[PDB]
């Protein structure tokens, strides 16, 4: 309603780089987008940029769970962006996510950790995009896709 796009990302990894470019392009195409600084319920789309350290943050994972729980009941459409991490690593929490989850496991409720894993697993099964040989092309596709998709 109030926002066409809600941007979920690990600031430390992408705020000043990929996200600054994606946000600029979205605003340019007149796409109303939200991104916190250093409304998920009121956003139509959720572009989630899962970077190397996204899963290292329990806060980012909490946001992903919030988003996926809303997506499950059709309250939001999620667009996955695998940035620097393979989709299968996200799906099984392997690759760099393994060590990040070992950390979480030693300091969080086991059931909460499983809840995080569930969101990631479900997230990795949605149709999305992976970072490749050109971020500028990836940004154009995302903007174009949303642009041809908004009411």
Q: Which residues are catalytic?
A: 63
Give the nearest residue (CB) to ligand [As]: 130
Closest listed residue to residue 128, CA positions, set 138, 119, 136, 118: 138
The sign of the torsion formed by the CA atoms of 4, 126, 102, 51 equals: negative
Q: Alpha helices of 11-134 — where are they, by DSSP H?
A: 11-14, 18-28, 58-72, 87-92, 96-105, 110-123
Closest separation in Å from C-beta 132 to ligand [As]: 8
Of 22 and 113, CB closest to ligand [As]: 22
Instruction: Rule CB under 6 A: say whether 130 interacts with ligand [As].
Output: yes
Instruction: Rule CB under 6 A: say whether 129 interacts with ligand [As].
Output: yes
Where along the sequence are the contacts to ligand [As] (CB under 6 A)?
82, 87, 129-130
């Amino acid at each position: 309603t109030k926002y066409d796009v809600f941007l979920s990302f690990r600031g430390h990894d992408t705020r000043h780089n990929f996200i600054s470019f994606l946000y600029k392009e979205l605003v340019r195409r007149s796409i109303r987008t939200f991104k916190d600084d250093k409304p998920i319920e009121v956003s139509r789309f959720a572009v989630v940029v899962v970077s190397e350290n996204y899963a290292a943050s329990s806060w980012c994972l909490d946001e992903l769970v919030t988003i996926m729980d809303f997506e499950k009941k059709g309250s939001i459409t999620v667009m996955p962006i695998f940035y620097g991490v393979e989709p299968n690593h996200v799906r099984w929490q392997t690759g760099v996510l393994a060590e990040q989850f070992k950390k979480h496991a030693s300091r969080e409720d086991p059931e909460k950790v499983l809840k995080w894993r569930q969101a990631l697993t479900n997230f990795a099964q949605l149709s999305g995009d992976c970072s490749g040989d050109d971020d500028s092309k990836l940004v154009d596709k995302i903007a174009n896709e949303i642009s041809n998709k908004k009411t």
